[PDB]
């Protein structure tokens, strides 16, 4: 949970270098993160290929066009952080996006939601993925004592 809290957290967690830019997809964002220009905690615009369900509160808002559009299941940019994108990619694709800091209470909430609305096997796989990502990002978090 420390790792996931680190994975999804607001700015000020570090010096948010490379903040305030737009990236074509989470892949190019990960490239930028690897290069070191971007840092994990920073607000940026991220696209999403088709099949990405958007946040439950993003459903009213949408893009601007004179023709009907259905953003509930097509492309949509979004102001978020790369870490939030990674956390959501861990969750199953059908699950709506989560953009808030996850901590422990919200983790219990979304885990219960998964347990209710999804089959057991998907729940087990999602828990395993959450475990792996959490341990990896807790390691990279650098929590210590001194």
């Amino acid at each position: 949970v420390l790792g996931l809290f680190f994975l999804t957290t607001d700015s000020e967690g570090r010096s948010p270098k490379g903040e305030g830019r737009a990236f074509g997809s989470s892949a190019e964002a990960i490239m930028a993160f690897d290069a070191g220009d971007l840092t994990l905690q920073a607000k940026i615009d991220i696209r999403f290929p088709v099949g990405t369900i958007p946040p439950r509160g993003f459903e009213p808002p949408a893009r601007e066009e004179g023709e009907p559009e259905w953003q509930q299941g097509d492309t949509f940019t979004l102001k978020t952080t790369l870490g939030r994108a990674l956390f959501n990619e861990l969750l199953p694709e059908d699950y709506p996006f989560v953009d808030y800091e996850v901590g422990k209470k919200q983790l219990s909430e979304i885990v219960n939601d998964l347990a209710e609305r999804y089959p057991k096997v998907i729940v087990a796989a999602t828990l395993d993925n959450l475990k792996a990502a959490g341990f990896f990002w807790a390691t990279r978090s650098g929590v210590t004592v001194a």
């Binding site: 089959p119 057991k120 096997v121 087990a124």
Partner: protein
Amino acid sequence: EGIINPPIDELLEATDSKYSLVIYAAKRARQINAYYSQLGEGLLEYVGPLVDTHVHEKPLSIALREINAGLLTSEAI
């Protein structure tokens, strides 16, 4: 290739209960184990694995596979 390899929800909706499912699968597994241990009598009442089988296997996995496929049916007395 695992204990969770056959998912459970299809079995639950197929048998409509959870304890009913385990007792029913256990009866089937007992039957297939006893068949594999025929060793030559060839009793007509006995029936072998309906689905394909590995060279070494646990009968309950086969029974559960048969339930998931659904061809097997049960009738209470």
